[PDB]
Amino acid sequence: IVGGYTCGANTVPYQVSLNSGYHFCGGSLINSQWVVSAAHCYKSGIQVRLGEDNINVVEGNEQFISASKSIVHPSYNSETYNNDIMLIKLKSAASLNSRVASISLPTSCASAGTQCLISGWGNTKSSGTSYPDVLKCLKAPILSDSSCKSASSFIITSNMFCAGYLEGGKDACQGDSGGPVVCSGKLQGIVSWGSGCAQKNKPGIYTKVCNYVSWIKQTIASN
Ligand SMILES: CC(C)(C)OC[C@@H](NS(=O)(=O)Cc1ccccc1)C(=O)NCC(=O)NCc1ccc(C(=N)N)cc1
Numbered sequence: 001i002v003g004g005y006t007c008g009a010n011t012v013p014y015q016v017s018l019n020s021g022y023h024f025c026g027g028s029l030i031n032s033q034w035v036v037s038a039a040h041c042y043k044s045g046i047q048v049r050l051g052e053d054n055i056n057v058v059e060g061n062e063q064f065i066s067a068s069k070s071i072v073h074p075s076y077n078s079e080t081y082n083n084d085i086m087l088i089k090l091k092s093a094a095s096l097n098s099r100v101a102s103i104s105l106p107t108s109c110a111s112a113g114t115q116c117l118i119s120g121w122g123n124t125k126s127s128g129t130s131y132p133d134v135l136k137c138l139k140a141p142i143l144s145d146s147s148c149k150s151a152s153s154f155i156i157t158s159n160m161f162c163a164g165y166l167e168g169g170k171d172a173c174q175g176d177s178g179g180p181v182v183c184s185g186k187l188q189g190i191v192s193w194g195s196g197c198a199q200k201n202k203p204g205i206y207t208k209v210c211n212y213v214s215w216i217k218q219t220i221a222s223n
């Protein structure tokens, strides 16, 4: 997260870190057994880490749980990142508490201008690299597709939205991949892609979660 702030320990209790020897992606706890992340975060040997603040120190509120199944969306396109969403089933149920909590899925999509909270342990610099050990947060509005497309020249599919600031300075970044965009208490976005970080006219692009709720529900019912 570039141009954000230190969240405070366990203030984003649905935020998970995916670990394969090191933190490599975020994710969001959606019930005691399931995490939503980005399809581009898929790999074998994922351990889900819940209740994290400092990812390098055991502070006492963590739960580390192996993935039993990973399910990349059937239509994920790794060339364009269309349908950039994956479900991870935990080997055992998380013990839900004030620091390890689920976030609700949307009933309806969010409109342009809606303010959201984006979080993660990704790079905090627009130029060069520094990786924070504690969770960082950013407030950002959803942008209209038309303003986003005209400013950036990006192709925005129906399954993507832009959020952030066209003036630059505030954005998600590498290492925030898979993490939540929460708006009015609903998981509306997943950190997906962009061009650099926090650059003028290059806002962040997010998987449009509301389009996937039927898939998520059916998948959970059958797995
Ligand atoms: C067109 C597509 C195949 C999707 O790839 C575009 C690619 N853009 S990039 O400019 O390579 C992403 C990047 C940004 C900073 C350092 C290194 C890489 C990209 O974003 N690749 C995936 C990726 O790196 N995702 C992480 C990410 C998270 C947030 C942001 C952001 N909001 N600015 C950008 C990339």
Ligand SMILES: [Ca+2]
Pocket: 052, 053, 054, 055, 056, 057, 058, 059, 062
């Ligand atoms: Ca920790």
